[PDB]
Enzyme design. Structure first.
Site, PDB file in Angstrom:
ATOM      1  N   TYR B  21       0.951  -1.281   0.052  1.00 32.79           N
ATOM      2  CA  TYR B  21       0.119  -0.126   0.056  1.00 32.79           C
ATOM      3  C   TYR B  21       0.989   1.291   0.002  1.00 32.79           C
ATOM      4  O   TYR B  21       1.310   1.724   1.092  1.00 32.79           O
ATOM      5  CB  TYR B  21      -0.995   0.000   1.125  1.00 32.79           C
ATOM      6  CG  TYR B  21      -0.268  -0.323   2.439  1.00 32.79           C
ATOM      7  CD1 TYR B  21      -0.166  -1.788   2.850  1.00 32.79           C
ATOM      8  CD2 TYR B  21      -0.147   0.646   3.519  1.00 32.79           C
ATOM      9  CE1 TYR B  21       0.370  -2.093   3.917  1.00 32.79           C
ATOM     10  CE2 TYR B  21       0.555   0.137   4.654  1.00 32.79           C
ATOM     11  CZ  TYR B  21       0.610  -1.248   4.826  1.00 32.79           C
ATOM     12  OH  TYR B  21       1.353  -1.629   6.067  1.00 32.79           O
ATOM     13  N   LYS B  39       5.879   2.907   6.355  1.00 40.88           N
ATOM     14  CA  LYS B  39       5.192   2.360   5.227  1.00 40.88           C
ATOM     15  C   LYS B  39       4.186   3.609   5.125  1.00 40.88           C
ATOM     16  O   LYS B  39       3.328   4.014   5.826  1.00 40.88           O
ATOM     17  CB  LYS B  39       4.390   1.168   5.869  1.00 40.88           C
ATOM     18  N   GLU B  97      10.085  -1.229  13.341  1.00 40.53           N
ATOM     19  CA  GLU B  97      11.672  -1.403  13.535  1.00 40.53           C
ATOM     20  C   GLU B  97      12.092  -1.457  12.215  1.00 40.53           C
ATOM     21  O   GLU B  97      11.585  -1.934  11.186  1.00 40.53           O
ATOM     22  CB  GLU B  97      11.644  -2.736  14.542  1.00 40.53           C
ATOM     23  CG  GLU B  97      11.239  -2.258  15.897  1.00 40.53           C
ATOM     24  CD  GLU B  97      11.329  -3.572  16.584  1.00 40.53           C
ATOM     25  OE1 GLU B  97      10.655  -4.748  16.212  1.00 40.53           O
ATOM     26  OE2 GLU B  97      11.756  -3.709  17.739  1.00 40.53           O
ATOM     27  N   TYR B  98      13.604  -1.525  12.132  1.00 39.62           N
ATOM     28  CA  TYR B  98      14.219  -1.513  10.961  1.00 39.62           C
ATOM     29  C   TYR B  98      15.168  -2.754  10.793  1.00 39.62           C
ATOM     30  O   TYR B  98      15.897  -3.063  11.646  1.00 39.62           O
ATOM     31  CB  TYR B  98      15.050  -0.233  10.464  1.00 39.62           C
ATOM     32  CG  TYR B  98      15.816  -0.468   9.369  1.00 39.62           C
ATOM     33  CD1 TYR B  98      14.928  -0.539   8.240  1.00 39.62           C
ATOM     34  CD2 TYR B  98      17.066  -0.540   9.251  1.00 39.62           C
ATOM     35  CE1 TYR B  98      15.643  -0.395   6.928  1.00 39.62           C
ATOM     36  CE2 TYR B  98      17.637  -0.266   7.783  1.00 39.62           C
ATOM     37  CZ  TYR B  98      16.941  -0.537   6.804  1.00 39.62           C
ATOM     38  OH  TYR B  98      17.534  -0.316   5.446  1.00 39.62           O
ATOM     39  N   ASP B 142       0.586 -15.332   5.016  1.00 37.81           N
ATOM     40  CA  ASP B 142       1.491 -14.889   3.953  1.00 37.81           C
ATOM     41  C   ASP B 142       3.056 -14.973   4.365  1.00 37.81           C
ATOM     42  O   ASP B 142       3.876 -14.085   4.270  1.00 37.81           O
ATOM     43  CB  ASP B 142       1.226 -13.319   3.852  1.00 37.81           C
ATOM     44  CG  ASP B 142       1.706 -12.730   2.463  1.00 37.81           C
ATOM     45  OD1 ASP B 142       2.173 -13.630   1.661  1.00 37.81           O
ATOM     46  OD2 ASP B 142       1.857 -11.522   2.343  1.00 37.81           O
TER      47      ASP B 142
END
Lengths: 241, 331
Positions: B21, B39, B97-98, B142
Protein backbone atom coordinates in the site's frame (compact mmCIF):
# COMPACT_ATOMS: atom_id res chain seq x y z
CA UNK A 1 -5.93 4.55 25.77
CA UNK A 2 -9.14 4.78 27.83
CA UNK A 3 -12.65 4.89 26.37
CA UNK A 4 -14.84 4.82 29.49
CA UNK A 5 -16.35 7.80 31.31
CA UNK A 6 -18.45 8.12 34.47
CA UNK A 7 -22.02 9.45 34.17
CA UNK A 8 -21.07 12.78 35.77
CA UNK A 9 -18.70 13.61 32.90
CA UNK A 10 -20.90 12.87 29.85
CA UNK A 11 -22.76 16.13 30.37
CA UNK A 12 -19.54 17.78 29.22
CA UNK A 13 -19.32 16.76 25.56
CA UNK A 14 -18.00 19.40 23.12
CA UNK A 15 -21.52 19.58 21.65
CA UNK A 16 -23.22 20.49 24.93
CA UNK A 17 -20.43 22.74 26.22
CA UNK A 18 -20.89 24.71 23.00
CA UNK A 19 -24.46 25.26 24.19
CA UNK A 20 -26.48 22.25 23.08
CA UNK A 21 -29.70 20.85 24.49
CA UNK A 22 -28.74 17.48 26.06
CA UNK A 23 -32.11 16.03 25.01
CA UNK A 24 -31.26 16.75 21.37
CA UNK A 25 -27.83 15.14 21.59
CA UNK A 26 -29.53 11.96 22.84
CA UNK A 27 -31.81 12.39 19.83
CA UNK A 28 -28.88 12.82 17.43
CA UNK A 29 -27.10 9.87 19.09
CA UNK A 30 -30.04 7.46 19.16
CA UNK A 31 -30.84 8.55 15.61
CA UNK A 32 -27.26 8.24 14.36
CA UNK A 33 -26.71 4.89 16.07
CA UNK A 34 -29.97 3.38 14.81
CA UNK A 35 -29.06 4.68 11.35
CA UNK A 36 -25.97 2.46 11.21
CA UNK A 37 -27.89 -0.59 12.49
CA UNK A 38 -30.33 -0.35 9.60
CA UNK A 39 -27.86 0.47 6.81
CA UNK A 40 -25.71 -2.47 7.86
CA UNK A 41 -28.31 -5.24 8.02
CA UNK A 42 -29.57 -4.16 4.60
CA UNK A 43 -26.10 -4.60 3.13
CA UNK A 44 -26.14 -7.90 5.02
CA UNK A 45 -23.23 -7.30 7.39
CA UNK A 46 -22.15 -9.23 10.49
CA UNK A 47 -23.50 -8.09 13.88
CA UNK A 48 -20.07 -7.29 15.31
CA UNK A 49 -19.48 -5.12 12.24
CA UNK A 50 -22.64 -3.20 13.14
CA UNK A 51 -21.52 -2.66 16.72
CA UNK A 52 -17.95 -1.44 16.04
CA UNK A 53 -19.27 1.21 13.67
CA UNK A 54 -21.75 2.35 16.30
CA UNK A 55 -19.15 2.41 19.08
CA UNK A 56 -16.86 4.41 16.79
CA UNK A 57 -19.73 6.84 16.22
CA UNK A 58 -20.44 7.29 19.94
CA UNK A 59 -16.71 7.76 20.55
CA UNK A 60 -16.22 10.28 17.74
CA UNK A 61 -18.72 12.79 19.11
CA UNK A 62 -16.99 12.84 22.48
CA UNK A 63 -14.31 14.98 20.81
CA UNK A 64 -16.45 16.85 18.27
CA UNK A 65 -19.71 18.78 17.91
CA UNK A 66 -22.76 17.74 15.89
CA UNK A 67 -22.76 21.25 14.43
CA UNK A 68 -19.40 20.87 12.69
CA UNK A 69 -20.19 17.30 11.64
CA UNK A 70 -23.58 16.21 10.22
CA UNK A 71 -24.83 13.26 12.28
CA UNK A 72 -25.74 11.14 9.27
CA UNK A 73 -22.53 11.38 7.23
CA UNK A 74 -20.26 10.48 10.16
CA UNK A 75 -22.29 7.34 10.80
CA UNK A 76 -21.81 6.30 7.18
CA UNK A 77 -18.07 6.86 7.52
CA UNK A 78 -17.97 4.85 10.75
CA UNK A 79 -19.62 1.88 9.05
CA UNK A 80 -17.16 2.16 6.16
CA UNK A 81 -14.16 1.74 8.46
CA UNK A 82 -15.93 -0.90 10.57
CA UNK A 83 -16.47 -3.09 7.51
CA UNK A 84 -12.75 -3.12 6.78
CA UNK A 85 -11.86 -3.57 10.46
CA UNK A 86 -14.15 -6.54 11.18
CA UNK A 87 -13.16 -8.11 7.85
CA UNK A 88 -16.65 -7.73 6.36
CA UNK A 89 -15.95 -4.77 4.05
CA UNK A 90 -18.34 -3.15 1.59
CA UNK A 91 -17.39 -0.73 -1.18
CA UNK A 92 -18.33 2.88 -0.45
CA UNK A 93 -20.44 2.87 -3.61
CA UNK A 94 -22.79 0.22 -2.21
CA UNK A 95 -23.37 2.01 1.12
CA UNK A 96 -24.19 5.36 -0.53
CA UNK A 97 -26.79 3.39 -2.48
CA UNK A 98 -28.27 2.72 0.97
CA UNK A 99 -27.59 6.31 2.09
CA UNK A 100 -30.09 7.86 -0.31
CA UNK A 101 -32.43 4.82 -0.13
CA UNK A 102 -33.48 4.27 3.52
CA UNK A 103 -33.46 7.86 4.51
CA UNK A 104 -35.39 11.11 4.51
CA UNK A 105 -34.40 13.21 1.52
CA UNK A 106 -33.54 16.16 3.78
CA UNK A 107 -31.71 13.78 6.15
CA UNK A 108 -29.74 12.77 3.05
CA UNK A 109 -29.00 16.45 2.61
CA UNK A 110 -26.36 16.05 5.32
CA UNK A 111 -23.96 14.38 2.87
CA UNK A 112 -23.79 17.53 0.75
CA UNK A 113 -22.71 17.49 -2.91
CA UNK A 114 -20.78 14.19 -3.06
CA UNK A 115 -21.52 11.66 -0.27
CA UNK A 116 -18.51 9.60 -1.41
CA UNK A 117 -16.03 12.42 -0.85
CA UNK A 118 -17.84 13.59 2.29
CA UNK A 119 -17.60 10.03 3.64
CA UNK A 120 -14.19 9.09 2.23
CA UNK A 121 -12.32 12.28 3.19
CA UNK A 122 -13.89 12.17 6.67
CA UNK A 123 -12.21 8.81 7.32
CA UNK A 124 -8.86 10.54 7.79
CA UNK A 125 -9.95 12.40 10.93
CA UNK A 126 -12.15 9.55 12.19
CA UNK A 127 -9.09 7.27 12.38
CA UNK A 128 -7.15 10.04 14.12
CA UNK A 129 -10.04 10.75 16.51
CA UNK A 130 -10.43 7.14 17.68
CA UNK A 131 -6.67 7.27 18.32
CA UNK A 132 -6.14 4.43 15.84
CA UNK A 133 -7.64 1.90 18.27
CA UNK A 134 -9.45 -0.34 15.82
CA UNK A 135 -10.13 -3.55 17.75
CA UNK A 136 -13.32 -3.27 19.79
CA UNK A 137 -15.17 -5.92 21.81
CA UNK A 138 -18.92 -6.19 22.44
CA UNK A 139 -21.36 -7.69 24.99
CA UNK A 140 -22.35 -10.26 22.33
CA UNK A 141 -19.16 -12.32 22.68
CA UNK A 142 -19.30 -12.49 26.49
CA UNK A 143 -23.04 -13.20 26.59
CA UNK A 144 -22.57 -16.51 24.77
CA UNK A 145 -19.38 -17.54 26.58
CA UNK A 146 -21.18 -17.02 29.90
CA UNK A 147 -24.33 -18.85 28.81
CA UNK A 148 -22.25 -21.82 27.69
CA UNK A 149 -21.02 -22.17 31.28
CA UNK A 150 -24.59 -22.24 32.62
CA UNK A 151 -25.81 -25.66 33.76
CA UNK A 152 -29.60 -26.05 33.54
CA UNK A 153 -32.43 -26.46 31.04
CA UNK A 154 -31.40 -25.46 27.51
CA UNK A 155 -34.73 -24.14 26.24
CA UNK A 156 -34.77 -21.78 29.22
CA UNK A 157 -31.26 -20.62 28.28
CA UNK A 158 -32.21 -20.55 24.60
CA UNK A 159 -34.91 -18.01 25.46
CA UNK A 160 -32.76 -16.32 28.12
CA UNK A 161 -30.00 -15.16 25.79
CA UNK A 162 -32.61 -14.73 23.04
CA UNK A 163 -33.87 -11.66 24.89
CA UNK A 164 -30.52 -10.71 26.43
CA UNK A 165 -29.08 -10.57 22.90
CA UNK A 166 -31.80 -8.22 21.69
CA UNK A 167 -31.09 -5.99 24.68
CA UNK A 168 -27.52 -5.46 23.45
CA UNK A 169 -28.99 -4.33 20.13
CA UNK A 170 -31.17 -1.94 22.13
CA UNK A 171 -28.32 -0.55 24.26
CA UNK A 172 -26.18 0.49 21.27
CA UNK A 173 -28.23 3.67 20.77
CA UNK A 174 -27.01 4.82 24.19
CA UNK A 175 -23.71 5.71 25.86
CA UNK A 176 -23.45 2.36 27.63
CA UNK A 177 -20.67 1.48 25.20
CA UNK A 178 -18.98 4.60 26.58
CA UNK A 179 -19.71 3.73 30.19
CA UNK A 180 -18.83 0.09 30.88
CA UNK A 181 -16.58 -2.72 29.62
CA UNK A 182 -18.43 -5.01 27.17
CA UNK A 183 -18.13 -7.91 29.63
CA UNK A 184 -19.93 -5.94 32.36
CA UNK A 185 -22.64 -4.84 29.94
CA UNK A 186 -22.96 -8.51 28.98
CA UNK A 187 -23.36 -9.40 32.65
CA UNK A 188 -26.01 -6.70 33.00
CA UNK A 189 -28.19 -7.99 30.15
CA UNK A 190 -27.97 -11.47 31.67
CA UNK A 191 -29.08 -9.94 34.98
CA UNK A 192 -32.00 -8.17 33.31
CA UNK A 193 -33.13 -11.06 31.09
CA UNK A 194 -33.06 -13.23 34.21
CA UNK A 195 -35.29 -10.92 36.25
CA UNK A 196 -38.17 -10.23 33.85
CA UNK A 197 -38.36 -13.96 33.08
CA UNK A 198 -38.15 -14.76 36.80
CA UNK A 199 -35.27 -17.18 36.13
CA UNK A 200 -33.02 -17.39 39.17
CA UNK A 201 -29.61 -17.74 37.53
CA UNK A 202 -27.50 -18.97 40.47
CA UNK A 203 -29.13 -22.41 40.47
CA UNK A 204 -27.22 -23.20 37.26
CA UNK A 205 -23.80 -22.32 38.67
CA UNK A 206 -21.28 -24.09 40.93
CA UNK A 207 -22.50 -22.01 43.87
CA UNK A 208 -26.35 -21.89 43.98
CA UNK A 209 -26.52 -20.01 47.29
CA UNK A 210 -24.51 -16.90 46.45
CA UNK A 211 -27.26 -14.66 45.07
CA UNK A 212 -24.84 -12.47 43.14
CA UNK A 213 -24.15 -15.18 40.55
CA UNK A 214 -22.18 -12.88 38.24
CA UNK A 215 -18.94 -12.68 40.25
CA UNK A 216 -17.99 -16.07 38.80
CA UNK A 217 -17.45 -14.30 35.46
CA UNK A 218 -16.39 -10.80 36.54
CA UNK A 219 -14.71 -9.33 39.62
CA UNK A 220 -16.27 -7.48 42.57
CA UNK A 221 -19.06 -5.94 40.47
CA UNK A 222 -21.73 -4.47 42.79
CA UNK A 223 -25.45 -5.10 42.25
CA UNK A 224 -25.91 -1.32 42.26
CA UNK A 225 -23.88 -0.71 39.09
CA UNK A 226 -25.68 -3.56 37.34
CA UNK A 227 -29.09 -2.07 38.12
CA UNK A 228 -27.89 1.27 36.73
CA UNK A 229 -27.23 -0.29 33.33
CA UNK A 230 -30.65 -1.98 33.48
CA UNK A 231 -32.55 1.26 34.20
CA UNK A 232 -30.90 3.17 31.35
CA UNK A 233 -32.14 0.44 29.00
CA UNK A 234 -35.65 0.38 30.48
CA UNK A 235 -36.11 3.99 29.33
CA UNK A 236 -35.56 2.72 25.79
CA UNK A 237 -38.60 0.45 25.91
CA UNK A 238 -40.49 3.26 27.63
CA UNK A 239 -40.29 5.38 24.47
CA UNK A 240 -38.35 3.96 21.50
CA UNK A 241 -37.91 0.21 21.06
CA UNK B 1 -2.97 9.09 20.65
CA UNK B 2 -1.32 8.07 17.37
CA UNK B 3 -1.50 10.06 14.15
CA UNK B 4 -0.86 13.31 15.96
CA UNK B 5 2.96 13.24 15.83
CA UNK B 6 4.82 14.82 12.91
CA UNK B 7 6.88 13.19 10.14
CA UNK B 8 9.31 16.08 10.69
CA UNK B 9 10.31 13.94 13.66
CA UNK B 10 11.93 11.58 11.16
CA UNK B 11 14.95 12.13 8.92
CA UNK B 12 14.22 10.09 5.76
CA UNK B 13 17.19 8.11 4.37
CA UNK B 14 15.97 6.26 1.29
CA UNK B 15 13.30 4.28 -0.53
CA UNK B 16 13.24 0.58 0.33
CA UNK B 17 10.55 -0.40 -2.14
CA UNK B 18 6.98 -0.07 -3.31
CA UNK B 19 4.88 -1.91 -0.74
CA UNK B 20 1.42 -3.48 -0.69
CA UNK B 21 0.00 0.00 0.00
CA UNK B 22 1.98 2.93 -1.44
CA UNK B 23 5.71 2.72 -0.63
CA UNK B 24 8.24 1.81 2.07
CA UNK B 25 11.02 4.15 3.23
CA UNK B 26 14.02 3.87 5.55
CA UNK B 27 14.33 6.73 8.04
CA UNK B 28 16.01 7.76 11.27
CA UNK B 29 14.48 9.75 14.11
CA UNK B 30 16.17 13.04 14.98
CA UNK B 31 15.20 12.58 18.62
CA UNK B 32 16.61 9.16 19.51
CA UNK B 33 18.62 8.42 16.39
CA UNK B 34 17.48 4.81 16.05
CA UNK B 35 16.57 3.83 12.51
CA UNK B 36 13.00 3.06 11.46
CA UNK B 37 10.92 1.65 8.61
CA UNK B 38 8.11 3.82 7.25
CA UNK B 39 5.17 2.39 5.34
CA UNK B 40 3.49 5.18 3.39
CA UNK B 41 -0.30 4.96 3.42
CA UNK B 42 -1.30 7.36 0.67
CA UNK B 43 -5.05 7.83 1.09
CA UNK B 44 -6.86 7.44 -2.20
CA UNK B 45 -10.43 8.71 -2.36
CA UNK B 46 -12.79 7.84 -5.23
CA UNK B 47 -11.35 4.38 -4.57
CA UNK B 48 -11.70 2.63 -1.19
CA UNK B 49 -9.55 4.87 1.02
CA UNK B 50 -7.62 3.45 3.97
CA UNK B 51 -6.52 -0.06 2.90
CA UNK B 52 -7.53 -3.13 4.92
CA UNK B 53 -3.94 -4.37 4.61
CA UNK B 54 -2.88 -1.37 6.69
CA UNK B 55 -5.83 -1.98 8.99
CA UNK B 56 -5.15 -5.68 9.60
CA UNK B 57 -1.56 -4.72 10.33
CA UNK B 58 -2.42 -1.98 12.84
CA UNK B 59 -5.21 -3.90 14.61
CA UNK B 60 -2.96 -6.91 15.19
CA UNK B 61 0.47 -5.35 15.76
CA UNK B 62 -0.93 -3.21 18.58
CA UNK B 63 -1.64 -6.52 20.30
CA UNK B 64 1.56 -8.20 19.16
CA UNK B 65 4.72 -6.97 20.83
CA UNK B 66 7.37 -9.67 20.55
CA UNK B 67 11.10 -10.04 19.94
CA UNK B 68 10.71 -12.09 16.75
CA UNK B 69 8.13 -9.80 15.12
CA UNK B 70 8.82 -6.44 13.51
CA UNK B 71 6.81 -4.33 15.95
CA UNK B 72 4.85 -1.24 14.97
CA UNK B 73 6.31 1.61 17.04
CA UNK B 74 3.79 4.33 16.13
CA UNK B 75 1.88 6.19 13.42
CA UNK B 76 2.66 9.68 12.09
CA UNK B 77 0.98 12.00 9.57
CA UNK B 78 1.82 14.59 6.91
CA UNK B 79 1.78 18.27 7.83
CA UNK B 80 -1.46 19.67 9.27
CA UNK B 81 -3.94 21.63 7.10
CA UNK B 82 -5.20 23.46 10.23
CA UNK B 83 -7.63 25.19 7.89
CA UNK B 84 -10.51 23.60 5.99
CA UNK B 85 -9.48 19.95 6.41
CA UNK B 86 -11.67 18.44 3.56
CA UNK B 87 -8.78 19.35 1.20
CA UNK B 88 -6.93 16.29 2.47
CA UNK B 89 -4.60 14.14 0.32
CA UNK B 90 -2.10 13.90 3.18
CA UNK B 91 -0.73 10.43 3.92
CA UNK B 92 -0.33 8.32 7.05
CA UNK B 93 2.99 6.69 7.92
CA UNK B 94 3.30 3.38 9.75
CA UNK B 95 6.43 3.31 11.87
CA UNK B 96 8.17 -0.04 12.34
CA UNK B 97 11.49 -1.42 13.52
CA UNK B 98 14.21 -1.59 10.86
CA UNK B 99 15.79 -4.74 9.38
CA UNK B 100 18.49 -4.53 6.66
CA UNK B 101 17.96 -7.83 4.90
CA UNK B 102 15.38 -10.47 4.17
CA UNK B 103 16.07 -14.19 3.80
CA UNK B 104 15.18 -14.11 0.11
CA UNK B 105 17.79 -11.45 -0.66
CA UNK B 106 20.59 -13.20 1.21
CA UNK B 107 19.89 -16.67 -0.23
CA UNK B 108 19.67 -15.24 -3.75
CA UNK B 109 23.39 -14.41 -3.76
CA UNK B 110 24.43 -18.02 -3.32
CA UNK B 111 27.17 -16.57 -1.15
CA UNK B 112 25.72 -17.05 2.27
CA UNK B 113 25.69 -20.50 3.79
CA UNK B 114 24.17 -20.70 7.25
CA UNK B 115 25.78 -23.19 9.62
CA UNK B 116 23.45 -25.61 11.40
CA UNK B 117 23.81 -23.57 14.59
CA UNK B 118 22.43 -20.57 12.70
CA UNK B 119 19.49 -22.43 11.18
CA UNK B 120 18.87 -23.77 14.69
CA UNK B 121 18.94 -20.16 15.87
CA UNK B 122 16.84 -18.71 13.06
CA UNK B 123 14.05 -21.31 13.27
CA UNK B 124 13.92 -21.11 17.08
CA UNK B 125 13.23 -17.38 16.75
CA UNK B 126 10.77 -17.78 13.88
CA UNK B 127 8.76 -20.55 15.53
CA UNK B 128 8.69 -18.53 18.77
CA UNK B 129 7.11 -15.55 17.00
CA UNK B 130 4.59 -17.70 15.15
CA UNK B 131 3.78 -19.59 18.34
CA UNK B 132 3.07 -16.20 19.90
CA UNK B 133 0.75 -15.24 17.02
CA UNK B 134 -1.13 -18.52 17.20
CA UNK B 135 -1.30 -18.24 20.98
CA UNK B 136 -3.03 -14.92 20.39
CA UNK B 137 -5.09 -16.48 17.60
CA UNK B 138 -3.66 -14.66 14.59
CA UNK B 139 -2.97 -16.30 11.24
CA UNK B 140 -0.17 -14.79 9.17
CA UNK B 141 -1.31 -16.35 5.91
CA UNK B 142 1.57 -14.82 3.99
CA UNK B 143 4.75 -16.43 5.30
CA UNK B 144 7.57 -16.56 2.76
CA UNK B 145 11.32 -15.94 2.60
CA UNK B 146 10.85 -12.34 1.47
CA UNK B 147 8.68 -11.80 4.56
CA UNK B 148 11.32 -13.13 6.95
CA UNK B 149 13.72 -10.29 7.80
CA UNK B 150 17.20 -10.55 9.36
CA UNK B 151 19.73 -8.03 10.72
CA UNK B 152 23.50 -8.43 11.05
CA UNK B 153 23.15 -9.26 14.75
CA UNK B 154 21.50 -12.55 13.77
CA UNK B 155 18.02 -11.56 14.99
CA UNK B 156 15.02 -12.80 12.99
CA UNK B 157 11.74 -10.87 12.70
CA UNK B 158 8.55 -11.87 10.89
CA UNK B 159 7.02 -9.14 8.75
CA UNK B 160 4.05 -8.11 6.59
CA UNK B 161 0.86 -8.75 8.57
CA UNK B 162 -1.22 -7.25 5.77
CA UNK B 163 -3.03 -10.54 5.17
CA UNK B 164 -3.26 -11.57 8.82
CA UNK B 165 -6.69 -12.31 10.31
CA UNK B 166 -8.07 -13.38 13.67
CA UNK B 167 -8.95 -17.06 14.11
CA UNK B 168 -11.28 -19.10 16.33
CA UNK B 169 -11.54 -22.88 16.54
CA UNK B 170 -15.37 -22.83 16.61
CA UNK B 171 -15.31 -22.55 12.80
CA UNK B 172 -17.18 -19.24 12.56
CA UNK B 173 -17.00 -18.50 8.83
CA UNK B 174 -15.40 -19.52 5.51
CA UNK B 175 -12.16 -17.68 4.76
CA UNK B 176 -10.49 -16.50 1.55
CA UNK B 177 -8.71 -19.81 0.70
CA UNK B 178 -6.60 -18.38 -2.14
CA UNK B 179 -4.06 -17.23 0.45
CA UNK B 180 -0.26 -17.47 0.73
CA UNK B 181 2.10 -17.44 -2.25
CA UNK B 182 1.76 -20.56 -4.39
CA UNK B 183 5.23 -21.85 -3.51
CA UNK B 184 4.63 -21.72 0.24
CA UNK B 185 0.99 -22.80 0.12
CA UNK B 186 -0.04 -25.98 2.02
CA UNK B 187 -1.89 -28.90 0.33
CA UNK B 188 -5.25 -28.27 2.05
CA UNK B 189 -5.47 -24.74 0.64
CA UNK B 190 -4.62 -26.09 -2.80
CA UNK B 191 -7.51 -28.54 -2.53
CA UNK B 192 -9.81 -25.62 -1.69
CA UNK B 193 -10.20 -25.58 2.11
CA UNK B 194 -12.05 -22.40 3.18
CA UNK B 195 -12.06 -22.83 6.97
CA UNK B 196 -8.36 -23.45 7.61
CA UNK B 197 -6.11 -23.77 10.66
CA UNK B 198 -2.96 -22.05 12.01
CA UNK B 199 -1.16 -25.15 10.68
CA UNK B 200 -0.97 -23.43 7.29
CA UNK B 201 1.76 -21.11 8.57
CA UNK B 202 3.63 -24.09 10.01
CA UNK B 203 3.73 -25.52 6.50
CA UNK B 204 5.21 -22.30 5.11
CA UNK B 205 7.90 -22.27 7.79
CA UNK B 206 8.64 -25.89 6.94
CA UNK B 207 9.06 -25.01 3.27
CA UNK B 208 11.50 -22.36 4.48
CA UNK B 209 13.33 -24.80 6.75
CA UNK B 210 14.02 -26.93 3.69
CA UNK B 211 15.05 -23.87 1.73
CA UNK B 212 17.72 -22.95 4.29
CA UNK B 213 19.48 -26.25 3.60
CA UNK B 214 18.89 -26.70 -0.12
CA UNK B 215 19.59 -22.98 -0.69
CA UNK B 216 16.66 -23.07 -3.14
CA UNK B 217 12.83 -23.13 -2.73
CA UNK B 218 11.66 -26.74 -2.36
CA UNK B 219 8.32 -26.24 -4.14
CA UNK B 220 8.48 -24.10 -7.26
CA UNK B 221 5.54 -24.28 -9.69
CA UNK B 222 3.55 -21.71 -11.67
CA UNK B 223 0.02 -23.12 -11.62
CA UNK B 224 -1.97 -24.51 -8.70
CA UNK B 225 -2.30 -28.07 -10.02
CA UNK B 226 1.38 -28.44 -10.92
CA UNK B 227 2.19 -27.34 -7.38
CA UNK B 228 0.14 -30.19 -5.91
CA UNK B 229 2.08 -32.80 -7.89
CA UNK B 230 5.40 -31.32 -6.80
CA UNK B 231 4.22 -31.74 -3.22
CA UNK B 232 2.94 -35.24 -3.95
CA UNK B 233 6.25 -36.04 -5.64
CA UNK B 234 7.95 -35.39 -2.30
CA UNK B 235 5.50 -35.63 0.62
CA UNK B 236 3.50 -38.44 -0.95
CA UNK B 237 0.11 -38.12 -2.59
CA UNK B 238 -2.94 -36.96 -0.59
CA UNK B 239 -5.14 -40.01 -0.03
CA UNK B 240 -7.35 -41.44 2.78
CA UNK B 241 -4.52 -43.61 4.14
CA UNK B 242 -2.04 -40.82 4.92
CA UNK B 243 -4.85 -38.34 5.39
CA UNK B 244 -8.33 -39.27 6.73
CA UNK B 245 -10.36 -36.10 5.98
CA UNK B 246 -9.27 -35.18 2.43
CA UNK B 247 -12.57 -36.46 1.03
CA UNK B 248 -14.31 -33.49 2.66
CA UNK B 249 -12.16 -31.19 0.50
CA UNK B 250 -13.83 -29.69 -2.62
CA UNK B 251 -11.21 -29.96 -5.39
CA UNK B 252 -9.67 -33.26 -4.23
CA UNK B 253 -11.25 -35.78 -6.60
CA UNK B 254 -10.89 -33.29 -9.46
CA UNK B 255 -7.38 -31.93 -8.85
CA UNK B 256 -5.32 -35.15 -8.61
CA UNK B 257 -1.55 -35.74 -9.05
CA UNK B 258 -0.44 -38.16 -11.80
CA UNK B 259 0.09 -41.22 -9.61
CA UNK B 260 -0.34 -42.21 -5.99
CA UNK B 261 3.20 -41.34 -4.92
CA UNK B 262 4.85 -43.00 -1.99
CA UNK B 263 6.34 -40.41 0.37
CA UNK B 264 9.90 -39.64 -0.75
CA UNK B 265 10.73 -36.80 1.70
CA UNK B 266 13.46 -38.39 3.84
CA UNK B 267 15.16 -39.65 0.65
CA UNK B 268 15.60 -36.31 -1.13
CA UNK B 269 16.48 -34.45 2.05
CA UNK B 270 18.71 -37.20 3.42
CA UNK B 271 21.80 -34.97 3.58
CA UNK B 272 20.06 -32.85 6.23
CA UNK B 273 21.02 -33.37 9.92
CA UNK B 274 19.02 -36.11 11.66
CA UNK B 275 17.00 -34.03 14.14
CA UNK B 276 16.51 -31.33 11.53
CA UNK B 277 15.09 -33.96 9.18
CA UNK B 278 12.78 -35.10 11.97
CA UNK B 279 11.38 -31.59 12.27
CA UNK B 280 11.07 -31.05 8.51
CA UNK B 281 9.34 -34.43 8.20
CA UNK B 282 6.78 -33.30 10.76
CA UNK B 283 6.32 -29.71 9.54
CA UNK B 284 5.55 -31.01 6.05
CA UNK B 285 2.79 -33.52 6.86
CA UNK B 286 -0.11 -33.72 4.40
CA UNK B 287 -2.89 -34.11 6.98
CA UNK B 288 -3.07 -30.75 8.80
CA UNK B 289 -4.34 -32.43 11.95
CA UNK B 290 -1.27 -34.66 12.03
CA UNK B 291 0.97 -31.71 11.16
CA UNK B 292 3.20 -30.07 13.74
CA UNK B 293 2.10 -27.04 15.76
CA UNK B 294 4.39 -24.07 16.39
CA UNK B 295 4.31 -24.92 20.10
CA UNK B 296 5.53 -28.41 19.20
CA UNK B 297 8.32 -27.24 16.87
CA UNK B 298 10.14 -25.68 19.80
CA UNK B 299 9.99 -28.99 21.64
CA UNK B 300 11.76 -30.91 18.86
CA UNK B 301 15.29 -32.24 19.40
CA UNK B 302 16.45 -29.77 16.75
CA UNK B 303 15.22 -26.67 18.58
CA UNK B 304 14.56 -27.63 22.19
CA UNK B 305 17.86 -26.54 23.71
CA UNK B 306 18.81 -23.83 21.21
CA UNK B 307 19.79 -21.11 23.68
CA UNK B 308 18.89 -17.64 22.39
CA UNK B 309 19.27 -16.41 25.96
CA UNK B 310 21.12 -13.12 26.27
CA UNK B 311 23.29 -14.02 29.24
CA UNK B 312 25.55 -16.42 27.35
CA UNK B 313 28.17 -14.70 25.17
CA UNK B 314 28.53 -12.82 22.95
CA UNK B 315 26.91 -9.51 23.89
CA UNK B 316 25.23 -7.99 20.86
CA UNK B 317 24.52 -4.24 21.32
CA UNK B 318 22.63 -3.77 18.05
CA UNK B 319 19.93 -6.22 19.02
CA UNK B 320 16.44 -4.75 18.97
CA UNK B 321 14.59 -5.53 22.20
CA UNK B 322 10.86 -5.12 22.79
CA UNK B 323 10.57 -4.89 26.57
CA UNK B 324 10.35 -1.14 26.21
CA UNK B 325 7.17 -1.36 24.13
CA UNK B 326 5.81 -4.33 26.07
CA UNK B 327 6.19 -2.40 29.33
CA UNK B 328 4.69 0.67 27.69
CA UNK B 329 1.89 -1.60 26.51
CA UNK B 330 0.00 -0.75 29.69
CA UNK B 331 -1.22 2.39 27.93
Amino acid sequence: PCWYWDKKDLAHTPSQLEGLDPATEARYRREGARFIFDVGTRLGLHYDTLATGIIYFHRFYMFHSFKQFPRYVTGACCLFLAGKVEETPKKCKDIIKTARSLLNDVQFGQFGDDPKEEVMVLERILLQTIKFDLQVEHPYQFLLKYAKQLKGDKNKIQKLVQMAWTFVNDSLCTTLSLQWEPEIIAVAVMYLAGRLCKFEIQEWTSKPMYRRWWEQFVQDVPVDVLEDICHQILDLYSQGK
Amino acid sequence: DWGKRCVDKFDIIGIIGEGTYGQVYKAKDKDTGELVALKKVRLDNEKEGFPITAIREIKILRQLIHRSVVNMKEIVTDKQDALDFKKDKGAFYLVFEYMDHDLMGLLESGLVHFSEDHIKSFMKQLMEGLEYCHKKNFLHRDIKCSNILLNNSGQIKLADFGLARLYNSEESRPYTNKVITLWYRPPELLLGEERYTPAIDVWSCGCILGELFTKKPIFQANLELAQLELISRLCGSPCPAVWPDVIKLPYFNTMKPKKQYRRRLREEFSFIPSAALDLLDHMLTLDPSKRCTAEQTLQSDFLKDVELSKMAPPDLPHWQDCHELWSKKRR
